Amino acid sequence: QIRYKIPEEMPTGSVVGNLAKDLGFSVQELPTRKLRISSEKPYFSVSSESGELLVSSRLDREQICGKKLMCALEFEAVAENPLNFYHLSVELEDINDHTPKFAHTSFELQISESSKPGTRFILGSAHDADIGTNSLQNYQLSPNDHFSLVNKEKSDGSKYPEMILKTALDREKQKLYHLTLTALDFGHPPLNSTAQIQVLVTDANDNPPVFSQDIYRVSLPENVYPGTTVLRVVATDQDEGVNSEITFSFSQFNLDSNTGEITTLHTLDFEEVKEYSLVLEAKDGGGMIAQCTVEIEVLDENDNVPEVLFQSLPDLIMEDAEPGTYIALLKTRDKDSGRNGEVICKLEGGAPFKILTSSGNTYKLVTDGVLDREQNPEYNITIRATDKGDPPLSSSSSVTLHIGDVNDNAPVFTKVSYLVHVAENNPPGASIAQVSASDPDLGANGQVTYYIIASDLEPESLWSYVTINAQSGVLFAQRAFDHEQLRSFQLTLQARDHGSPTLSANVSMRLLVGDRNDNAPRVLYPTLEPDGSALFDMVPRSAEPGYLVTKVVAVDADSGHNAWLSYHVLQASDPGLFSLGLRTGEVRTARALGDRDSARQRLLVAVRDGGQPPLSATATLHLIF
Amino acid sequence: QIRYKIPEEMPTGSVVGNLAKDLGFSVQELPTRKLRISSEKPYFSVSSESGELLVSSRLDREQICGKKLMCALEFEAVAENPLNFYHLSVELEDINDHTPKFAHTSFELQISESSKPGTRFILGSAHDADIGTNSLQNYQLSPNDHFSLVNKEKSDGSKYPEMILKTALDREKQKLYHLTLTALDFGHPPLNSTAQIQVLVTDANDNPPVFSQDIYRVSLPENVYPGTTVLRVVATDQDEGVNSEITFSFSEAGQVTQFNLDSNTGEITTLHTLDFEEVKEYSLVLEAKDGGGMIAQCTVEIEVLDENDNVPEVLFQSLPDLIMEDAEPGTYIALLKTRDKDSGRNGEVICKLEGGAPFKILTSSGNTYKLVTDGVLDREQNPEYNITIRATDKGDPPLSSSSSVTLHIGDVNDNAPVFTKVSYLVHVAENNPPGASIAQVSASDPDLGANGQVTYYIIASDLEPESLWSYVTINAQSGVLFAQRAFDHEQLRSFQLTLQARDHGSPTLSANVSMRLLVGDRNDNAPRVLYPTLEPDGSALFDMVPRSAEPGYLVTKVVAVDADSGHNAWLSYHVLQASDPGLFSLGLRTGEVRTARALGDRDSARQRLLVAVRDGGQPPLSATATLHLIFAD
Ligand SMILES: *[C@@H]1O[C@H](CO[C@@H]2O[C@@H](C)[C@@H](O)[C@@H](O)[C@@H]2O)[C@@H](O[C@@H]2O[C@H](CO)[C@@H](O[C@@H]3O[C@H](CO[C@H]4O[C@H](CO)[C@@H](O)[C@H](O)[C@@H]4O)[C@@H](O)[C@H](O[C@H]4O[C@H](CO)[C@@H](O)[C@H](O)[C@@H]4O)[C@@H]3O)[C@H](O)[C@H]2NC(C)=O)[C@H](O)[C@H]1NC(C)=O
Ligand SMILES: *[C@@H]1O[C@H](CO[C@@H]2O[C@@H](C)[C@@H](O)[C@@H](O)[C@@H]2O)[C@@H](O[C@@H]2O[C@H](CO)[C@@H](O)[C@H](O)[C@H]2NC(C)=O)[C@H](O)[C@H]1NC(C)=O
Ligand SMILES: *[C@@H]1O[C@H](CO)[C@@H](O[C@@H]2O[C@H](CO)[C@@H](O)[C@H](O)[C@H]2NC(C)=O)[C@H](O)[C@H]1NC(C)=O
Ligand SMILES: *[C@@H]1O[C@H](CO)[C@@H](O)[C@H](O)[C@H]1NC(C)=O
Ligand SMILES: *[C@@H]1O[C@H](CO)[C@@H](O)[C@H](O)[C@H]1NC(C)=O
Ligand SMILES: *[C@@H]1O[C@H](CO)[C@@H](O)[C@H](O)[C@H]1NC(C)=O
Ligand SMILES: *[C@H]1O[C@H](CO)[C@@H](O)[C@H](O)[C@@H]1O
Ligand SMILES: *[C@H]1O[C@H](CO)[C@@H](O)[C@H](O)[C@@H]1O
Ligand SMILES: *[C@H]1O[C@H](CO)[C@@H](O)[C@H](O)[C@@H]1O
Ligand SMILES: *[C@H]1O[C@H](CO)[C@@H](O)[C@H](O)[C@@H]1O
Ligand SMILES: [Ca+2]
Ligand SMILES: [Ca+2]
Ligand SMILES: [Ca+2]
Ligand SMILES: [Ca+2]
Ligand SMILES: [Ca+2]
Ligand SMILES: [Ca+2]
Ligand SMILES: [Ca+2]
Ligand SMILES: [Ca+2]
Ligand SMILES: [Ca+2]
Ligand SMILES: [Ca+2]
Ligand SMILES: [Ca+2]
Ligand SMILES: [Ca+2]
Ligand SMILES: [Ca+2]
Ligand SMILES: [Ca+2]
Ligand SMILES: [Ca+2]
Ligand SMILES: [Ca+2]
Ligand SMILES: [Ca+2]
Ligand SMILES: [Ca+2]
Numbered sequence A: 001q002i003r004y005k006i007p008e009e010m011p012t013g014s015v016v017g018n019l020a021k022d023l024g025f026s027v028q029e030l031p032t033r034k035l036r037i038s039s040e041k042p043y044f045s046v047s048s049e050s051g052e053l054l055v056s057s058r059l060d061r062e063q064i065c066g067k068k069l070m071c072a073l074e075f076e077a078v079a080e081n082p083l084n085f086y087h088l089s090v091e092l093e094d095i096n097d098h099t100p101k102f103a104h105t106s107f108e109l110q111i112s113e114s115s116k117p118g119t120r121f122i123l124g125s126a127h128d129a130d131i132g133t134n135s136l137q138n139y140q141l142s143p144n145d146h147f148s149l150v151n152k153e154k155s156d157g158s159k160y161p162e163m164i165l166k167t168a169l170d171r172e173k174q175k176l177y178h179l180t181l182t183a184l185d186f187g188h189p190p191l192n193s194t195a196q197i198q199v200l201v202t203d204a205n206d207n208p209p210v211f212s213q214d215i216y217r218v219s220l221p222e223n224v225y226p227g228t229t230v231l232r233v234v235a236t237d238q239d240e241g242v243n244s245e246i247t248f249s250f251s252q253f254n255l256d257s258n259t260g261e262i263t264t265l266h267t268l269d270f271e272e273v274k275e276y277s278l279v280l281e282a283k284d285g286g287g288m289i290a291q292c293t294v295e296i297e298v299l300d301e302n303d304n305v306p307e308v309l310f311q312s313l314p315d316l317i318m319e320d321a322e323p324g325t326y327i328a329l330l331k332t333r334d335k336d337s338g339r340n341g342e343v344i345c346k347l348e349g350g351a352p353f354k355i356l357t358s359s360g361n362t363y364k365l366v367t368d369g370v371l372d373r374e375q376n377p378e379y380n381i382t383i384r385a386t387d388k389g390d391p392p393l394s395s396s397s398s399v400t401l402h403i404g405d406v407n408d409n410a411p412v413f414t415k416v417s418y419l420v421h422v423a424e425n426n427p428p429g430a431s432i433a434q435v436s437a438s439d440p441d442l443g444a445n446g447q448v449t450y451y452i453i454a455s456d457l458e459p460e461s462l463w464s465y466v467t468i469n470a471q472s473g474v475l476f477a478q479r480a481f482d483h484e485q486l487r488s489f490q491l492t493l494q495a496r497d498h499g500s501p502t503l504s505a506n507v508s509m510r511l512l513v514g515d516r517n518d519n520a521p522r523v524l525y526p527t528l529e530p531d532g533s534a535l536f537d538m539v540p541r542s543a544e545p546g547y548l549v550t551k552v553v554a555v556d557a558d559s560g561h562n563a564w565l566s567y568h569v570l571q572a573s574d575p576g577l578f579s580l581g582l583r584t585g586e587v588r589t590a591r592a593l594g595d596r597d598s599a600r601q602r603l604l605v606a607v608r609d610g611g612q613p614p615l616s617a618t619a620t621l622h623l624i625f
Numbered sequence B: 001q002i003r004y005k006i007p008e009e010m011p012t013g014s015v016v017g018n019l020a021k022d023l024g025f026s027v028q029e030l031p032t033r034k035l036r037i038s039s040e041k042p043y044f045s046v047s048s049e050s051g052e053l054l055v056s057s058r059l060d061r062e063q064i065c066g067k068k069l070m071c072a073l074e075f076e077a078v079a080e081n082p083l084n085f086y087h088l089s090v091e092l093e094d095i096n097d098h099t100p101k102f103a104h105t106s107f108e109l110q111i112s113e114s115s116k117p118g119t120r121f122i123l124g125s126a127h128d129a130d131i132g133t134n135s136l137q138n139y140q141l142s143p144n145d146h147f148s149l150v151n152k153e154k155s156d157g158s159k160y161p162e163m164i165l166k167t168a169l170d171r172e173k174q175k176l177y178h179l180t181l182t183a184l185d186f187g188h189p190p191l192n193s194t195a196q197i198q199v200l201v202t203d204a205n206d207n208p209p210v211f212s213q214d215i216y217r218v219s220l221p222e223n224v225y226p227g228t229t230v231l232r233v234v235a236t237d238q239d240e241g242v243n244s245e246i247t248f249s250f251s252e253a254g255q256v257t258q259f260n261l262d263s264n265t266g267e268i269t270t271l272h273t274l275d276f277e278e279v280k281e282y283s284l285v286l287e288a289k290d291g292g293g294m295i296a297q298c299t300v301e302i303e304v305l306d307e308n309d310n311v312p313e314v315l316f317q318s319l320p321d322l323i324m325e326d327a328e329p330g331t332y333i334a335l336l337k338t339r340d341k342d343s344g345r346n347g348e349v350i351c352k353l354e355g356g357a358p359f360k361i362l363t364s365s366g367n368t369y370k371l372v373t374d375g376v377l378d379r380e381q382n383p384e385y386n387i388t389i390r391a392t393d394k395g396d397p398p399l400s401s402s403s404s405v406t407l408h409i410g411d412v413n414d415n416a417p418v419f420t421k422v423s424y425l426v427h428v429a430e431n432n433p434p435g436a437s438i439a440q441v442s443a444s445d446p447d448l449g450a451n452g453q454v455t456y457y458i459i460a461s462d463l464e465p466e467s468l469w470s471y472v473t474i475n476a477q478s479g480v481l482f483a484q485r486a487f488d489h490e491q492l493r494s495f496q497l498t499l500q501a502r503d504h505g506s507p508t509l510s511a512n513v514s515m516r517l518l519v520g521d522r523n524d525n526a527p528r529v530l531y532p533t534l535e536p537d538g539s540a541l542f543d544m545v546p547r548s549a550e551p552g553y554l555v556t557k558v559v560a561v562d563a564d565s566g567h568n569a570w571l572s573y574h575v576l577q578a579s580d581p582g583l584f585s586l587g588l589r590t591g592e593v594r595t596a597r598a599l600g601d602r603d604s605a606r607q608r609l610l611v612a613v614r615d616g617g618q619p620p621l622s623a624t625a626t627l628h629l630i631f632a633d
């Protein structure tokens, strides 16, 4: 056989070769035989006039042989007279008419952020229809620092390009990358194909949420109502998507997980917990955690009242207390602190007492002046302690001070001097008077007693005359008094209390003896014989009337009307002859003496007193001329 | 003429019959004469060689005679030499080549549900082109229970089938029926035609809307805000389409408006606030109707419940403005009632007294209470009381009511006036001016009014009861004591009085007090000398005194008295002046004038002395006296 070589896609009417020269047929021997090309598809034709082969239909190697290495089409040539056939095999060369081309103009790839460097990712190979050197040969990527190109070629021609990661990705630096890949064949000339690849770095949870500061500081009062916004902390996560979600947690208050704010749930208190320390943990979906701390310094409010403590209680104190003695001991204490715990105390009232501070929160009560029980025996004193909060809280305490009795008052009698008259011949041991003294003191100091100390009488008979009841003050006569023996007497008495020492008071009392008509009248002159007769026989007969015969003198031991002596005439031998002085007692002659009258004259008189009833003393007078 | 009989639809070139044998023409006489069939349309032909009749054009009886009773086709036959014509009439038989068939493959009928039984409905008759026995003869319908078929032929010859209703229809049982109708001819063989008929029962308004129950029961509080969904009622209509639309309405009831019903949804919700005290129960009648005026009604009973929204009330009916202090224990003071608008435990009211006042509540019957004294009362201690009464119900939460009463206690004369001191002691100086205040007594009476108005009187005295006015008097209103005379200590030293304080009540209460009044002594009386008596000059003579008298000789003794008492009457005797000092001795206490020393001859016989009687009063009062004493021999 014979072989010819032409390129594919050859235009029609092109000379493949003269068969007349290769088969040995003359230019005139040729038209005799009707040259006809025999083939399944009429790709060729023989113009009988020219005597050579010519291209007829379009010669598409990719549609006939395709990937076949050598395309050898065997057709026939028929010539008539004589009937003869010749088989001709033609081989066509591949033309680089099909440039390489990728399946998609653009396709995006999503690569994770935590992709390890050196990982190989497969890429779709472009489809180049030509075979041999005109086939796809070189894949080349844009020069950068993050990705690289690798060709993997086996002998079978199923070679493909893949992308090797050069450095680790980081979506926070550049979220996306756009590169151009070029496929190139080795033909004349070489023609290339471009394809864009866009890599979007998928987020990974490599950055944890971070707080603004390590330590925060907040101060709030202890009286905040439940629900006060204490503090809110905010964290920042460098990721995006779910890996950026931040949740807060604790690891009397309350924290919301999403908003991240901490608010109180119950009332605070300074006396139990002064400051709180809280630890907050922020976590994302992938367990990346970070913790911070917040210190809440609760402020001390003046909500507790200061207290006044009494330590020594003096129920009884002396009235003669010197100024400035330590009476009671007080302290002031407050649970709060600072100006809320500092307490200043004062006393309210006009009582003479002062507060003296010896040291911090230590005070003493002293007397400011001299005291007295009789004027003010009791005091209700009020003491006020106030702190230095704004506004302050105060505390009052009331003490009842009682004043004791000191023996500073002597018993006093109801009257300055006493005077008592007592009738004569009184029964002994009888009540004559009663004295009463008052002592304002209390207890034994107010127990009065009366005694006798001195008297103008003889000190030995002082007991025999009078005595005193020391408890009641009644005076008792120890003998029947005699107005004739003693007329009056002075006494001095003493009132004394039962204290230490005893205070005394002296009183003066005069006792008088009233005269009673207990003595009969006694005749002094003239003297009488046992019969009671006196004889005066020297009376002149020639005496003129009015002659002083004699005079009777009488006395009475009593005094006053009880001694008032009046002289009467009981009986007489001659009435009208004698005249008597009712007051003086002078017996005289009333008329002249007649001789008829008898020589012997008898008279009987009686001396009487003005008492009721009167006592009489009789006497007889014999008078002879 | 001559007649032949053949069937129609005969194929061409078929022998109908030999005309040579019926017309008498020889087989050689025939080609001489030009046998030709003469007709308007060449349905036949004569083959001269055959000498017989032959079919030429198509012989369609339906296009020639059609429905004509007898089909007689009359043509002629012309023969030439000699010219002669023969009339030929042929009669063709109808072929059963057209089977009966209805006009439409499917036709639907819409029949009402309330169609009376026995009604005839028209159906399209099939058209069979053949005539006679080959024509349509039998109409037959599928055997069922609701419809029947009947064939009707009118005088005009227009035969038709019709459907007779067997039973009344019901679209809720079977909404449609599909049957098969067969048309049959009476030929050999019979060929059939099928036609399907679908009857859709048209809806009628025979089913009313029906409720679930005749009577419903709902209970709601009396304090529901306007707009509370009271209840939801639903009705069911067995029809479909517009005849199934259900509308609700209020019908035949009290038109008073407190509820509200939506027509379509049928829910009832309140429109105003409820109340139990005015209307205890409500009755509602609901009407549900469709488009055709078919109605059905139901009833709902709303039993409103009594809520504890009314406060219990404490009614005071009797007011004890004045009550006696000596009220016996357990006396009826005040009359109270308790009332509550609510019911049940919401209307049950319990009343109590809070405080420390001595009063108790005693229940005589339901909601009937009385106030009684628990202890003894006193006006002086507590004259007025403010009592508080609390009434609480048994609802949750309960409602309470407090009421304050001001009771005043009257004064009863049960206290006698009391003096400030048990006994009184007052000293009054002698020679006091008459009508002057000497003392004042005060009595206290705890009673009020006239019972607490004290008055003082004099009742008893140790003095003469008739001159008591001349002695002392009392101001009965103030209690001051007034002396009606200048007192004399010498006449009387003291006197007793018994007085009584009495109020002006009924009866009067008295109290007696004893007072001793003492007259203070003043030194207003001078001492007077009794013995010896003195002449106008104040001289006394005691002569005839012996010169040889021993010392201690009692010259005389002076007696003197003083009307006063005490120091004002204590008489001491002094020596004012003397002609010879030391010659005479006087008793300072006794008053005895004696000789102190012996009488010398140098001394004169007559001795004069001047003494004074003094008292211990302040200042002392003195009485002077002169004594002349003469000696003899
Ligand atoms: C990949 O294919 C690229 C396209 O090339 C064409 O299409 C392929 C399929 C083949 O058919 C090929 O034969 C075709 O040429 C190709 O890119 C080309 O690269 C050349 C050289 O680098 C570029 O030539 C230079 O052009 C610039 C300015 O060009 C302007 O116009 C062109 C239109 O053609 C535009 O595309 C450009 O963007 C510009 O706007 C000139 O300044 C430069 O001058 C220099 O070179 C000349 C030589 O001719 C010297 O005389 C001068 O002194 C200068 O030194 C070039 O002329 C060409 O523009 C560019 N085309 C495109 C479309 O990008 C690339 O080479 C192929 N790669 C491989 C490996 O084959
Ligand atoms: C109360 O009387 C006593 C005794 O009085 C007597 O007369 C006085 C005027 C004076 O001279 C005293 O000496 C007489 O004894 C007085 O007190 C007593 O005095 C004595 C002597 O110094 C002494 O030993 C006693 O202890 C004293 N007794 C008392 C109780 O003090 C006293 O001065 C008179 N006055 C008063 C107010 O008590
Ligand atoms: C208080 O004194 C009055 C007045 O004397 C008394 O009333 C009378 O007392 C006397 C006895 O001395 C009776 O004879 C009378 O009958 C009493 N009068 C009456 C009762 O109206 C009275 O009894 C004394 N006591 C009191 C507590 O009033
Ligand atoms: C002082 O306290 C006492 C204690 O019982 C009281 O009785 C008295 O009345 C008080 N002082 C005054 C002035 O009320
Ligand atoms: C109609 O006629 C055919 C022919 O014999 C028969 O098979 C068929 O059953 C008939 N149908 C009815 C409904 O008569
Ligand atoms: C009673 O109430 C009146 C007026 O409110 C008041 O003046 C009086 O003091 C009260 N009495 C008592 C015992 O509460
Ligand atoms: C004793 O009795 C007399 C009565 O004679 C009172 O005067 C004295 O006070 C004491 O009681
Ligand atoms: C004096 O008076 C007294 C009074 O008793 C008489 O008894 C006596 O006899 C004389 O007459
Ligand atoms: C009248 O005056 C006297 C004083 O002289 C008082 O003692 C009495 O109480 C009344 O007031
Ligand atoms: C008594 O004493 C009084 C004075 O108290 C004198 O005035 C009078 O003359 C007599 O001597
Ligand atoms: Ca090609
Ligand atoms: Ca090619
Ligand atoms: Ca290529
Ligand atoms: Ca990163
Ligand atoms: Ca994260
Ligand atoms: Ca990230
Ligand atoms: Ca606190
Ligand atoms: Ca605090
Ligand atoms: Ca404090
Ligand atoms: Ca004192
Ligand atoms: Ca004292
Ligand atoms: Ca004392
Ligand atoms: Ca005597
Ligand atoms: Ca006498
Ligand atoms: Ca005497
Ligand atoms: Ca026909
Ligand atoms: Ca038929
Ligand atoms: Ca027919």
Ligand SMILES: [Ca+2]
Pocket (backbone or CB within 6 Å): B113, B170, B171, B172, B206, B207
């Ligand atoms: Ca029905």
Ligand SMILES: [Ca+2]
Pocket (backbone or CB within 6 Å): B113, B171, B172, B203, B204, B205, B206, B207, B238, B239
């Ligand atoms: Ca219906």
Ligand SMILES: [Ca+2]
Pocket (backbone or CB within 6 Å): B205, B206, B207, B208, B209, B237, B238, B239, B243, B244, B290, B294
């Ligand atoms: Ca209906």
Ligand SMILES: [Ca+2]
Pocket (backbone or CB within 6 Å): B222, B223, B274, B275, B276, B277, B309
């Ligand atoms: Ca209500």
Ligand SMILES: [Ca+2]
Pocket (backbone or CB within 6 Å): B308, B309, B310, B311, B312, B340, B341, B342, B346, B347, B393, B395, B399
């Ligand atoms: Ca109620």
Ligand SMILES: [Ca+2]
Pocket (backbone or CB within 6 Å): B276, B277, B306, B307, B308, B309, B310, B341, B342, B343
């Ligand atoms: Ca109610």
Ligand SMILES: [Ca+2]
Pocket (backbone or CB within 6 Å): B325, B378, B379, B380, B414, B415
């Ligand atoms: Ca009373």
Ligand SMILES: [Ca+2]
Pocket (backbone or CB within 6 Å): B325, B379, B380, B411, B412, B413, B414, B415, B446, B447, B448
């Ligand atoms: Ca009373």
Ligand SMILES: [Ca+2]
Pocket (backbone or CB within 6 Å): B413, B414, B415, B416, B417, B445, B446, B447, B451, B452, B503, B505, B509
């Ligand atoms: Ca009274």
Ligand SMILES: [Ca+2]
Pocket (backbone or CB within 6 Å): B488, B489, B490, B524, B525
């Ligand atoms: Ca007088």
Ligand SMILES: [Ca+2]
Pocket (backbone or CB within 6 Å): B430, B489, B490, B521, B522, B523, B524, B525, B563, B564, B565, B568
């Ligand atoms: Ca007097």
Ligand SMILES: [Ca+2]
Pocket (backbone or CB within 6 Å): B523, B524, B525, B526, B527, B562, B563, B564, B568, B569, B615, B617, B621
């Ligand atoms: Ca006098």
